[PDB]
């Protein structure tokens, strides 16, 4: 078998956001935070502010050409969700982004966006949906540095959700679930003013836990395939995209992988046949979110577009399995290159 680590390692560098762009959202969320914490009229409503979404979980790819990644941010609110609609906590923010963000900034139906120099950011008004002295608690969870940290899990491959964590330093395990698995947020549904429920705290335990098991290997293999899905947009169906395609992969790969080669070829294999009588019966599955458990991920997801992705995993598979077993670095290497273009180098 070829597993050509170097030329995986360049690649995965190449499809990465820049540095530009980090230092970008990391200023940008914390700037925001901290906007946020000193503006009078929201002083007292907002608990916290936190990076979430791909960039949180090293899960993001970059953009191509001038366009700026998507950086999701919530923000908690102690606003009691049963007498307030979405709408109600979102008309509180138009001073604050008037003031600090003038042209900058838009609505987009559940969420704000704002434009920085390098990157877009995503901001979603959450509540806690429990009260009294049941928030306050969940509420100290939301103000640690476990949630505060602005860095993302590929460069905290330890952390864990638990108040007490605190980074290494170069030189504690995720607390209970008692304490917070049951406990989502609620943030606005995206077409009607009314709460839905969200975990994105559970998601992202849930995604670190995941590549510790799989030997870092499990979101720089969710990138691959991203990326895969992104050079191959015209052969492929809209959807599955985003988190949706996250979760596909997290849920096809096995734990213990040793190469982003081999793990590459076994979750498209296991996607393959797990899926096959649900693809012979031109049907979708339903998979539990990590956050929600109640949620089908899979929810808005076609079955004509999941019987297609099907067809365009299985067509990729092929090429995959002949990468892996060639004899020869520059075939093998040929083969990688037709499934993630010109960004994965020949040795
Ligand atoms: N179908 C879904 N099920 C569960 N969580 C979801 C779903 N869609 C969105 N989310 C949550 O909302 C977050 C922001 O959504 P978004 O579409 O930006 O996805 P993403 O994971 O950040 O991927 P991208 O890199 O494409 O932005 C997700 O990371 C996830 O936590
Ligand atoms: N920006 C976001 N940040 C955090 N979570 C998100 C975000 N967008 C979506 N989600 C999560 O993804 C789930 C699905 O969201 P989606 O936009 O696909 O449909 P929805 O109609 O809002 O969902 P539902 O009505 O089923 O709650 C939501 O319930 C929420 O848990
Ligand atoms: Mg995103
Ligand atoms: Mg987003
Ligand atoms: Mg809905
Ligand atoms: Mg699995």
């Known amino acids: 078998s070829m597993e050509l680590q170097p030329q995986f390692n360049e690649f995965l560098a190449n499809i990465r956001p820049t540095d530009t762009q980090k230092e970008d959202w990391k200023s940008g969320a914390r700037t925001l935070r ?29 953009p191509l050409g001038d366009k700026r ?33 003038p042209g900058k900034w838009e609505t987009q139906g559940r969420s704000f966006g704002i434009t920085l120099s390098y990157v877009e ?34 460069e905290q491959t330890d952390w864990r ?29 995206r077409e009607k003013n009314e709460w839905g429920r969200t975990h994105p705290l559970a998601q992202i335990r849930w995604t670190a836990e995941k590549n510790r098991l799989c030997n870092g290997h499990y979101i720089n293999l969710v990138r691959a395939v991203k990326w895969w899905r992104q050079q191959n947009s015209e052969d ?8 949706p395609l996250e ?18 070829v076994q979750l498209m294999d296991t996607f393959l046949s797990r899926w096959a009588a649900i693809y012979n019966q031109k049907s979708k599955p339903w998979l539990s979110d990590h956050g929600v458990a109640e949620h089908d991920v899979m929810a808005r997801l076609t079955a004509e577009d999941f019987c297609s992705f ?12 002949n ?13 990688w290159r037709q499934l993630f273009g010109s960004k994965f180098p020949l040795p």
């Open 323 to 335: 990468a892996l077993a060639s004899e020869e670095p520059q075939e093998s290497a040929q083969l």
């Open 121 to 154: 950011l995503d901001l979603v008004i959450t509540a806690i949906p429990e009260s009294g002295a049941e928030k306050s608690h969940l509420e100290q969870l939301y103000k640690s540095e476990s949630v505060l940290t602005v860095n993302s899990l590929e």
């Open 236 to 243: 492929l169906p809209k959807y599955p995209k985003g988190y």
């Open 247 to 264: 979760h596909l992969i997290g849920n096809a790969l096995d734990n213990g992988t040793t190469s982003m080669a081999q793990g590459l």
């Open 161 to 189: 959700l638990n108040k007490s964590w605190t980074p290494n330093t170069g030189w504690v395990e995720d607390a209970p679930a008692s304490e917070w698995k049951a406990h989502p947020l609620v943030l606005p549904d």
């Open 69 to 101: 990644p998507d950086v999701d941010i919530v923000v908690v609110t102690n606003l009691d969700h049963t007498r307030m609609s979405p709408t109600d906590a979102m008309d509180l923010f138009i001073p604050f982004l008037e003031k600090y963000y």
């Open 310 to 321: 099907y067809e365009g995993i299985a067509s990729a598979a092929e090429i995959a399995r």
């Open 34 to 62: 901290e906007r946020l914490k000193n503006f009078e009229p929201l002083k007292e409503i907002v608990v916290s502010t936190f990076l979430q979404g791909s960039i949180r979980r090293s899960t993001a790819i970059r």
